[PDB]
Amino acid sequence: PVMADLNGGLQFVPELKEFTAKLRKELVETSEVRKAVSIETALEHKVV
Amino acid sequence: DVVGTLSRNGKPVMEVTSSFFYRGNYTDFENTFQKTVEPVYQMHIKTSKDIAVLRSKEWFQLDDEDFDLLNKTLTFETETEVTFKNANIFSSVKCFGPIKVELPTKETVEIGIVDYEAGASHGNPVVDFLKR
Amino acid sequence: PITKES
Amino acid sequence: IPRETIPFLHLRKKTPAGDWKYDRQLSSLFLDGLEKAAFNGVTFKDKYV
Known part of the structure; x- marks a missing residue:
């Protein structure tokens, strides 16, 4: 029997779950704050 | 809108307020000004996004930049002074x-x-x- | 660089 | 426990690589538990199984 690792060295990044989850949090955080700050600077412009 | 302050022994005792109205048609907006004391506004800061929005605003100026706002309740005790260009534009x-x-x-x-x-x-x- | 054996 | 020797009963630790290899320390903890148990007995009072 043959066993082929076709896993791009992913085995070697530790705490793969916590790390994966951090990457998603930081992307979403960056998106959310930019969308909110966008909407609010738009409204502050409109009021003025 | 006029505001008096009665003092005795150089200490405030009571405030009088009286409002007068000159019936007529007035254009002299350069002699027009209005000060108002806003109601106190409250905010529960829950998310790190909430705090990012506040830092966005030039007017939000903390004594200590690094103050931890997370899960805190801020109150905003605010007066607003305004002068007039015309009926609409300040x-x-x-x-x-x-x-x-x-x-x-x-x-x-x-x-x-x-x-x-x-x-x-x-x-x-x-x-x-x-x-x- | 991550795929040595430490 | 002769160092170089793996006991007939042991515990294992997960390596960062992800395999479960013998761990001398945990195995000591367990084997000492057994020795204690054999001489003095173990109580399970207040254990719901």
Whole structure:
């Protein structure tokens, strides 16, 4: 029997779950704050 | 709108307020000004996004930049002074007063200052923000 | 660089 | 426990690589538990199984 690792060295990044989850949090955080700050600077412009 | 202050022994005792109206048609907006004392606005800061939005605003100025706002309750005790260009457009808009954090004891304590200043505006964007 | 054996 | 020797009963630790290899320390903890148990007994009072 043959066993082929076709896993791009992913085995070697530790705490793969916590790390994966951090990457998603930081992307979403960056998106959310930019969308909110966008909407609010738009409204502050409109009021003025 | 007029505001008196009666003092005895160089100490305030009571405030009088009286409002007068000159019936007629008046254009002299350069002699027009209005100061209002806004209601106290409260905000529960839950998310790190909430705090990012506040730092976005020039007028939100903390004593200590690194103050941890997360899960704190801020109050905004705000006066707004305005001058008029005409019936609609304000010639200038000022909105200032202390920003306070609620402690465990329920005592509010100054941690910074609202400081907004502007020329020709159609509105006060600080009160608009705090209202919503 | 991550795929040595430490 | 002769160092170089793996006991007939042991515990294992997960390596960062992800395999479960013998761990001398945890195995000591367990084997000492057994020795204690054999001489003095173990109580399970207040254990719901």
